[PDB]
Amino acid sequence: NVQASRQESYTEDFIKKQIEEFNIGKRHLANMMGEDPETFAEEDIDRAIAYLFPSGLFEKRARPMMKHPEHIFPKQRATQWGEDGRPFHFLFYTGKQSYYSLMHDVYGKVMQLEKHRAESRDLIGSRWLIKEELEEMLVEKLSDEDYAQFIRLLEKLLTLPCGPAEEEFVQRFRRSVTIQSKKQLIEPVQYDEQGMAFSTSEGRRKSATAQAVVYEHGSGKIHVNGVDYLIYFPITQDREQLMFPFHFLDRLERHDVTCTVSGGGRSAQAGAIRLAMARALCSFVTEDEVEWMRQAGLLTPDPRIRERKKPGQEGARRKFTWKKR
Amino acid sequence: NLLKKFSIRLRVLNGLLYKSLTELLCTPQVSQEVYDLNVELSKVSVTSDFSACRVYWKTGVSAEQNKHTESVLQRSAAYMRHLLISQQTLRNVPPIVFVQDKRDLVLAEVDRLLAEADFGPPHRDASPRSFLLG
Amino acid sequence: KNRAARVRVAKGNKPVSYEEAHAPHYIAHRKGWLSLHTGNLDGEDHAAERTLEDVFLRKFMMGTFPGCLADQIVLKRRANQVDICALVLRQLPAHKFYFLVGYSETLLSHFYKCPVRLHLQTVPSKVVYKYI
Amino acid sequence: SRYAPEFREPLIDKEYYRKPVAELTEEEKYDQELKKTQFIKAAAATETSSVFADPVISKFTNMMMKGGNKVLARSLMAQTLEAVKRKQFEKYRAASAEEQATIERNPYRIFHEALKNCEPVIGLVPILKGGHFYQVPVPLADRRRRFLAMKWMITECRENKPRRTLMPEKLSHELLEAFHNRGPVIKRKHNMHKMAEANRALAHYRWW
Amino acid sequence: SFFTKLTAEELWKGALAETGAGARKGKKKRKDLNRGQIIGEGRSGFLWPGLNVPLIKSGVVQNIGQRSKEEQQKVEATMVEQREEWDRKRKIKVKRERGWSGNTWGGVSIGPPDPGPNGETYEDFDTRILEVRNVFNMTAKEGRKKSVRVLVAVGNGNGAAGFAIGKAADRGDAFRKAKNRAIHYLHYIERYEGHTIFHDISLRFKRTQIRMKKQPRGYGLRCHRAIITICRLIGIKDMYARVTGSMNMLNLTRGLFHGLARQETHQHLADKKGLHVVEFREECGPLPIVVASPHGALSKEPEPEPEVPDTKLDWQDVKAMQGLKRSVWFNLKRPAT
RNA sequence: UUGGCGGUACUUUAUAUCCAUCUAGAGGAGCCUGUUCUAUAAUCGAUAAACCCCGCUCUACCUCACCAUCUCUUGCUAAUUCAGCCUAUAUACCGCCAUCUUCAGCAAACCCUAAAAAGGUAUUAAAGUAAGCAAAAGAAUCAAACAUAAAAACGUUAGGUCAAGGUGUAGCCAAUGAAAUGGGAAGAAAUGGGCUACAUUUUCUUAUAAAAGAACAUUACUAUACCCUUUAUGAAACUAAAGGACUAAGGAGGAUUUAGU
Ligand SMILES: [K+]
Ligand SMILES: [Mg+2]
Ligand SMILES: [Mg+2]
Ligand SMILES: [Mg+2]
Ligand SMILES: [Mg+2]
Ligand SMILES: [Mg+2]
Ligand SMILES: [Mg+2]
Ligand SMILES: [Mg+2]
Ligand SMILES: [Mg+2]
Ligand SMILES: [Mg+2]
Ligand SMILES: [Mg+2]
């Protein structure tokens, strides 16, 4: 008994009407955009809505949407009993009919395997589904203790002898682990009008950006912005930074590089070239060497950039003096 | 029944508590385990309010030895408080807490380095009145 | 604490609209702009004049439709045309709206010397985004 | 930091990567295979595989730098090594064959052996007990012991030198004079040790 | 200037000063000034077709006009009268009945409980208040928090009654919580012939003693004011009761329902002993009246009748029959209950 | 039965932090700027943390609210025995904020208790439940992360602001209102913050931060002061900049304190 509106819940009759309007919505949206209604799809709908209702709101949940009711409306709002009031599932009164119905099946499988009576690593590089994924399969809220108990039961199933039916079952709750390989992506090897091989790669340090063009065969002649490298870089430390890629792979005096660095200062421009050269030099080295470069810092872009000044303090971190009290 | 049933002054209390707890730990009176630990006491510091009593015991090199010594010492600290009230050392004793003192290890370290050092050459709302009106 | 344009929490009985619920830092993220003109774009003139005209147009519509406005009005300038889009409660008779539309349009076209049109969407009652 | 904590410090040792697989300890071998699926920090601008790069000398340069003037600080260190090499060449040429053998003309070896001669084994940390400031003997770590040697050198030269002398001429004259265990920096080390011996009895008053 | 003018909501918010440092830790009244204003009506008295006057009159399309100075003065005076009348309406209110006193909540009806889950209306039930406590505790919200504990009773006057306690920070909420809770704890009280208890009842609930007596028709309810309220809810019309010891309202309500709900009907007594239950009224002479007969087999062994009973007698009951003078306060003339 | 604070000083805890470690500063000199004090015919407000280059992203006139002196009386508006009011109370308020604070709580409606002043957890589970607000998430810094910004409820300080504006109550209407002219001064003073120098990792010159040639202690370094010229803005130079000399003190700054991962 409060002014806050009563819980808004959706019946099967309500969602059913929301799906008829959506189906009639598609036929109108198709007629607007001049497309054929039969083939009009979810992808075309989202594109049409973006043209007819251009919104530049940064958060995409707040933009106009004409989606199917299944997506927008919470799925876990379906009638669980009939007209006579008798629930449909024998575990209705537990409050977690779907979680306990699943724990009922897995416990019955375990009993038959134990009564009836090889390597268990049938699948590798897989993980157990996270609670958020499980909650989606069950379509009901689970607690952290409920998730832990389900996994322990599934593990016990794997320990026991498993027929092909059991392996398919546990597969449903095994999700492929992401295979993000931190391995450098080698650039192609183009050919010049003369016919010499060369690779190109970009590099960015602070505000400086470089575009190197390493040549497979050379005597070590580096030209920066159409100038020599001793002239362009009068500082010793800046030249050393250009030496690091080649010296590491013992490839000094074997390549001819032509660089074009714009932006930043003297040190930031040398660093930008170093990464650009290291990435272009990848095409002319063995894969074992490319990994050696990656593990020495030569292929990682440096993310350190100047931080903004903050209002009310002298600098990015420097604070105004705390006046003597 | 049973289940329900179950400046200068601080200098004097700090020194005497140290003088007595050292004796309790030199015999199996507290326990045989506590006797075998061969624990040493750096000092005792009683708080100003007397809410607690700090007992600093000279920690050792091995973390495992220290972790075991800590657990055994703490479990017996409640019983150790009983022994001091029962022998009439002090009428009131605060909850004894055992603290570590790793200075002893540092004290040995200094001598080793120092010897090797190069010194060099020398009402109306509550009432029904509003309601009754309408 | 920041007090700017925030409808503060009550005890769950205050009905705030979508516009009222969102604080200033959600501008351009979850809620858009009530006025759309070209005067605040880069290298454009007459920002001061467009902003003053909007302030008046908002006070004028409130007084001309007193208690009949469900939400803040939306102002759209295209070329020299001004367009006022207001959600209005269905309190007044229908013919009274036809009078206030004819009056408010003619009066505002002769005051700012531009074509002004009024677009009214009638709601049965204020739309409540959430109870706070 | 802009590097997430999952990032690994880069290893810029050229020989380590090119060693035969069998020459690597299984612990080192494990790290290489693990690092293949991890993130590595980009190498610093001052981190290179150069055979002439000495970490200690690179560190000494940064401790002389003022306001991010690395070119000037590196120049002062480069001029110093040269000023020491030129000072030993003069003595070597002006010495007999017997004396010539002992004379060392490598500046990098005079710098490292000089600093080592200025490192103090023990230290003194200033504490307050009983309303007075009582310092106590402390044992110094390898990092604190190395920092103190470099800091004492960069401070003797910066301050206690004539107005018209330059740092490459005062630092060279101190590295060489320390290299023989007779400089003022060595005296500073003797005083720190000597003070600790005086306070050896009162080491008790340490709580950290 | 026209640009420094604020809306009514912000003007009253500032003037009322409800949200302020003084208000929270320790009179101006709000008014609506658009209540009587008709869109299109101004001081000048212009008449606007389609806004404040008919657009067409007797088939004639109207044009703009203005009221005369005399006509406008009447309209201004009429609105002033309506405003003054509205103020009178605010003062006026429908008086509701007091309870045991004029400033107390005990005995005050608060209506029937709210409808149930499936439209179960309880219009036949009445709710009465018995105690209202305003108690303050010590929580960080106000330092000393506020609490209202309300004891209520409900009954349909036809044998079904119940009581509950509702607690809240606001009194109105404590009423709803108690009122709807009591409908879930309905005792059924057995009434002899629908107007009195079946037999004398004496009980002690904690330190509160209650002593009820069965009485003939027309006797009325001569009981503690709280018992009269409950007896009306139960439907008892004639009874006597005395309360001694502590006067705790909760112990009296708990003690009353405990005793009234554990009484033995005549039909039950006939079954327990197997004998006929016969009634002898002095206004019917020696005529024996059979009020309950055993459901099963009637026994043939007469109930033992002792020569001298060992009943435990109350001195208060016996004292009267012994000829001892009563208090000046006993059996005074009182209004009909 | 609760709430509190007492000496919660005890164990873990903070993370550019309480001490320690590190770097550059402040504390000394010269100036710039705020405040207090003295003081003037001459604003006001802020004024421990959470004031002191604060309202001001800005005072030669204007700005201006101050003071002296002279003048106006239906005195901005369609109307009004009305206009106007920076007049008192921020201890009547709105509005917009500081603070604890990137702290973690605030918790409505139901249900249960041998009556409840209150409480309501156990996961191999024992009465609690299904929803909000903040946090998280999301979005922004235009790949990705991280980081930074933004966000941060309820209370605490009757904290700040009637002088952004609006407003309750009280006060002035030939004056507490309106306008014009000219002033709103200073320091053998204290203190907060900033700036520059004290130099050799320096000074000047050309390049450019590479390199080179000179200077390098009595004025060498070293005056964003005073003074002297020219110039820009302006009606007004009292302002700012650029030269010119004049050049004084200062030789790295006691206890002590600020910022930075
Ligand atoms: K306020
Ligand atoms: Mg800085
Ligand atoms: Mg009365
Ligand atoms: Mg004030
Ligand atoms: Mg002035
Ligand atoms: Mg003036
Ligand atoms: Mg005035
Ligand atoms: Mg993001
Ligand atoms: Mg967040
Ligand atoms: Mg005046
Ligand atoms: Mg001029």
Q: What is the DSSP string of B80-131?
A: HHHHHHHTTS-S--PPEEEEEE-HHHHHHHHHHHHHHS------TTTSTHHH
A172 within 8 A of A235, measured Cβ to Cβ:
no
Distance CA A12, CA C52 (A): 52
Chain A positions with Cβ closer than 8 Å to D: 181-183, 235-237, 240-241, 243-244, 247-248, 250, 267, 270-271, 275, 291-292, 294-298, 300-305
CA–C1' distance D120–F146 (Å)?
Answer: 40
The b/e string for A31-50 (b: 16+ C-beta within 10 A; e otherwise) is eeeebeeeebeeebbeebbe
Name the residue among A237, A302, A305 with its Cβ closest to that of D46: A237
Contacts of B109 in chain D (CB under 8 A): 139
Experimental method of this PDB entry: cryo-EM
- A311 CA vs F39 C1’ separation (Å): 39
Query: Which residues, at least 6 apart from C130, have a Cβ–Cβ distance to it below 8 Å?
Result: C15, C16, C21
| Alpha-carbon gap, residue D184 to D202, rounded angstroms | 28
3-state helix vs strand vs coil in chain A, percent to 5? 45, 10, 45
Q: Which two tokens stand for residue E44?
A: 């000048």
Compute the C-alpha angle B97/B101/B105, nearest 5°: 160
- State phi, psi for B93 to the nearest 5 degrees: -130, 135
In angstroms, the CA D200 to CA B80 distance is 35
Three-state secondary structure call for residue C67: coil
Tell me, what amino acid is at B98?
F
Tokens of D10: 């880069």
DSSP A237-273: HHHHHHHHHHHHTT-TTS-EEEE-EESS-HHHHHHHH
E3 CA distance to ligand 5 centroid (A)?
29
Packing angle between helix B63-86 and helix B8-24, nearest 10 degrees? 110
- Cα distance between residue A260 and residue B126, in whole Å: 84
Q: Alpha carbon of E164 to those of E130, E146, E151, E319: distances in Å?
A: 10, 20, 6, 37
Strand F-proximal residues of A, range 153-212, CB below 7 A, are none
Task: With beta carbons less than 8 A apart as the criterion, state whether A299 and A276 touch.
Answer: no
Chain C residue numbers touching E6 (CB-CB < 8 A): none
Q: Which of A14, A122, A18, A129 is nearest to A77 (CA)?
A: A14
d(CA D17, CA A29): 62
**Residue A85, SS3 per DSSP:** coil
Mutation target among D30, D48, D57 for the A interface, most CBs of A within 10 A: D48
**Cα–Cα dist E111/A81, whole Å:** 36
Helix locations, chain D, DSSP H:
14-18, 26-35, 55-64, 70-93, 97-102, 107-117, 142-159, 167-179, 184-198
Give the 3-state secondary structure of residue B56: strand
* Å: C56 CA to F43 C1': 36
Neighbour tally for E168: CB within 10 Å: 17
- From edge to edge, which strands make up the β-sheet containing E160-168? E109-111, E126-137, E145-155, E160-168, E187-188
Written as six digits, the tokens of B124 are 């109306």
Report the C-alpha gap between E119 and E141 in whole angstroms: 38
Q: Label residue E193 left, alpha or beta by phi (over 0 means left) and psi (-120 to 50 means alpha).
A: left
Place of tokens 């909540």: E105
In angstroms, rounded to a whole number, what is the distance separating the alpha carbons of residues D129 and D199? 14
Q: Which nucleotide is nearest to D3 (CA to C1')?
A: F146
Strand, helix or coil for residue B8: helix
Question: A88: which DSSP letter?
Answer: S
What is the maximum alpha-carbon separation in chain E? 109
Q: Is E217 exposed, middle or buried (0-12, 13-18, 19+ CB in 10 A)?
A: exposed
Beta carbons of C55 and E51 less than 8 Å apart: no
Of A182, A183, A235, the CB nearest to D71: A235
A236: nearest Cα among D166, E16, C27, D70: D70
* Residues of chain A neighbouring D17 (CB-CB closer than 8 A): 292, 295-296
A317 CA, F16 C1': separation in Å? 10
For A218, A220, A243, the CA distances from A252, given in Å and listed in that order, are: 10, 6, 8
Q: Which residue numbers of C have CB closer than 8 Å to E's CBs?
A: 55-56, 59, 62, 66-67, 92, 95-96, 98-100
Q: Which residues pair with B53 in a beta bridge?
A: B46, B96
Give the whole-angstrom CA distance, residue B113 versus residue B115: 5
Q: How far apart are CA A51 and CA A67, in angstroms?
A: 15
**Cβ C131–A62 below 8 Å, yes or no?**
no
Task: Say how far residue C11 (Cα) sits from the centre of its chain.
Answer: 28
Helices (H), chain E: 8-16, 21-25, 69-91, 171-182, 225-234, 249-260, 266-273, 315-321
Helices D167-179/D184-198 angle, 10° precision: 60
- Answer for the pair E162, E155: CB distance below 8 angstroms, yes or no: yes
